[PDB]
Write an enzyme that holds these catalytic residues in place. Structure first.
Site, PDB file in Angstrom:
ATOM      1  N   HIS A 195       0.806  -1.215   0.000  1.00 52.45           N
ATOM      2  CA  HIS A 195       0.000   0.000   0.000  1.00 52.45           C
ATOM      3  C   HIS A 195       0.844   1.271   0.000  1.00 52.45           C
ATOM      4  O   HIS A 195       0.350   2.330  -0.421  1.00 52.45           O
ATOM      5  CB  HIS A 195      -0.931   0.001   1.225  1.00 52.45           C
ATOM      6  CG  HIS A 195      -2.182   0.798   1.034  1.00 52.45           C
ATOM      7  ND1 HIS A 195      -3.060   0.568  -0.001  1.00 52.45           N
ATOM      8  CD2 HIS A 195      -2.687   1.841   1.731  1.00 52.45           C
ATOM      9  CE1 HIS A 195      -4.059   1.428   0.072  1.00 52.45           C
ATOM     10  NE2 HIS A 195      -3.861   2.207   1.120  1.00 52.45           N
ATOM     11  N   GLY A 246      -1.151   5.448  10.951  1.00 53.61           N
ATOM     12  CA  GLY A 246       0.286   5.303  10.942  1.00 53.61           C
ATOM     13  C   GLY A 246       0.800   3.963  11.414  1.00 53.61           C
ATOM     14  O   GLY A 246       2.020   3.756  11.421  1.00 53.61           O
ATOM     15  N   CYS A 292       0.013   1.011   9.970  1.00 51.78           N
ATOM     16  CA  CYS A 292       0.245   0.127   8.833  1.00 51.78           C
ATOM     17  C   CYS A 292       1.678  -0.396   8.847  1.00 51.78           C
ATOM     18  O   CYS A 292       2.630   0.362   9.046  1.00 51.78           O
ATOM     19  CB  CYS A 292      -0.039   0.877   7.521  1.00 51.78           C
ATOM     20  SG  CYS A 292      -0.537  -0.207   6.178  1.00 51.78           S
TER      21      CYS A 292
END
Ligand SMILES: Cn1cnc(Cn2c(=O)nc(Nc3cc4cn(C)nc4cc3Cl)n(Cc3cc(F)c(F)cc3F)c2=O)n1
Ligand SMILES: Cn1cnc(Cn2c(=O)nc(Nc3cc4cn(C)nc4cc3Cl)n(Cc3cc(F)c(F)cc3F)c2=O)n1
EC number: 3.4.19.12
Lengths: 299, 297
Positions: A39, A141, A143
């Site tokens: 991502h 944040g 991820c």
């Protein structure tokens, strides 16, 4: 008896920050590879409906900024394995632990090291729900945060955090980059299948409660495995297998309570409710302790 | 909303084991000093009624086995400060973090790194109860395990584990060896005082629910602090301090709900109940999340 995570030092030493454009998240630095969610290549328009192979082919090595603390690591290569991007860097992590990548089964537990911009923030225990979500504590944040178990100083990585679902539960992948569950790494509202309760874990936790001097829920009755599974399925509990009964052996041995006796106890709690009482200070039936988690903490 | 420990690595690289005779426990290695419970100088027959002064006089530097893993750290000096032994070793710990020793107040939370024979095994968050016990999870061999908070890479050490009590809760000291609570380091039957609910943390929990849109319990009343304190004690809740009102300030500002208006809300929950409704999906009021924990989450 508390939810206990593994010591996180061996994993902290591996967390880095990865940035592509303005998009940024956490990565895992093992030897000379940084693993992170793919991502990160998405701009905000891309996030809504990404064609990842197409986005990745248009990327260069210098499009990737990897920061390990205050030092920058130079990406010398990049590839994609399902939803995980693998960034080859020009420096090996000297604090790489002995590790394996594993895919856990629903009902199993792992420690989560929550990270933000590459800095570790907290550690706590989660379980893989039967609907392949986890009920974690994650903010923007996070991820790229990872879950793991540690056995004899070898770290088994089993989860890499990707997204929050609208219901607030969390979805991610294993470290080969396959999602747990029917989710996709796209910014679109995604629902999970109906969740059910991890029966063998509830039984483990009832045993824990007995080991810690609490028995108010026990009764005289016994049940058969099939008659218990009828009631369980009616209350959206997962079926109990004979392997589960065998895994619960040591806890039955230690307490002298037969597994089907504990099942009879659980059956009544499911039919008659808890009537206001608490087990190990909880008002609900806790299902995020495995039999191993209970054993490891009572012995 | 989960109980979250701080990452433990900065403390892991400071855990050692200390052995005297056959008595073995955990110590903390910071610069060239190892800190551990003085109970380590006890043999089995000493633990009941130990004479720590007379036990330390039979002791020399060479009676102390300090090991980082299986590597021995040579002890070059030894002294007692309250209930902790300070062992000077010949090697400054290269992984010593920036640290402080702090004494915490009841209601404050901290992470516990549970260790066995110098080897970390788990980490979890605890709250110091008003009766100065903690609802820990400790096995045999956990003596000397420490609790800590981490603020901007600085580790604040606040707890060193000593003993389990009959009720199954735990008792320890700060890092200067002063016990929390009315306990002493003897293998004697000591009973925790009667416990109370940590009012400042229940209020923090109510602010957390309001932040998340769960606010049915807000009412049109207000109270004074003294009035609220006198009623809280009748429900076995802790009275609020001036420092307590101040650490609720950030949450009060974030939600726009005056601290005293939230006390009036809790007072109504104390006098009437939840009447079958939940708060943050729970029928019980959580009291082990501090205002700092609430904002961190
Ligand atoms: C509330 N919450 C709980 N867990 C999470 C994890 N999470 C996340 O940390 N970030 C996400 N999107 C990003 C936005 C960015 C903005 N900048 C500048 N950089 C960013 C990087 C990311 Cl990754 N998301 C959303 C999300 C992440 C995915 F990997 C995915 F496949 C779909 C998604 F919708 C996110 O959930 N947030
Ligand atoms: C089940 N549990 C939960 N917490 C604890 C903590 N705890 C502990 O780990 N050890 C203790 N006594 C020792 C025995 C030893 C046997 N050998 C070979 N070496 C030993 C070292 C110790 Cl410290 N105790 C008891 C205890 C320890 C103290 F420091 C104290 F002041 C009074 C006490 F009764 C203990 O509680 N066990």
């Amino acid at each position: 008896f508390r939810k206990m995570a593994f010591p996180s030092g061996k994993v902290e030493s591996c967390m880095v920050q990865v940035t592509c454009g303005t998009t940024t998240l956490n990565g895992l630095w093992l030897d000379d590879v940084v693993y992170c969610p793919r991502h990160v290549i998405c701009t905000s328009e891309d996030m809504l409906n990404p064609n990842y192979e197409d986005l990745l082919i248009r990327k260069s090595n210098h499009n990737f900024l990897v920061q390990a603390g205050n030092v920058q690591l130079r990406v010398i290569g990049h590839s994609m394995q399902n939803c995980v991007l693998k960034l080859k860097v020009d420096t090996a992590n000297p604090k790489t632990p002995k590790y394996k990548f594993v895919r856990i089964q629903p009902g199993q537990t792992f420690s989560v090291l929550a990270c933000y911009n590459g800095s570790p923030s907290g550690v706590y225990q989660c379980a893989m729900r039967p609907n392949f979500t986890i009920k974690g504590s994650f903010l923007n944040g996070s991820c790229g945060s990872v879950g793991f178990n540690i056995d004899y100083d070898c770290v088994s990585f089993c989860y890499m955090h990707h997204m929050e679902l609208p219901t607030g539960v969390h979805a991610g992948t294993d470290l080969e980059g396959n999602f747990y569950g029917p989710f996709v790494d796209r910014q679109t509202a995604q629902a999970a299948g109906t969740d059910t309760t991890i029966t063998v874990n509830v039984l483990a936790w009832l045993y824990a409660a007995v080991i810690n001097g609490d028995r108010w829920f026990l009764n005289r009755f016994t049940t058969t495995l099939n008659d218990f599974n009828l009631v369980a399925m009616k209350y959206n509990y997962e079926p109990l297998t004979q392997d589960h009964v065998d895994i619960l052996g040591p806890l039955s041995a230690q307490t002298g309570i037969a597994v089907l006796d504990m099942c009879a106890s659980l059956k009544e709690l499911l039919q008659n409710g808890m009537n206001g009482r608490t087990i190990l200070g909880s008002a609900l039936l806790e299902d995020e302790f495995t039999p191993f988690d209970v054993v490891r903490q009572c012995s």
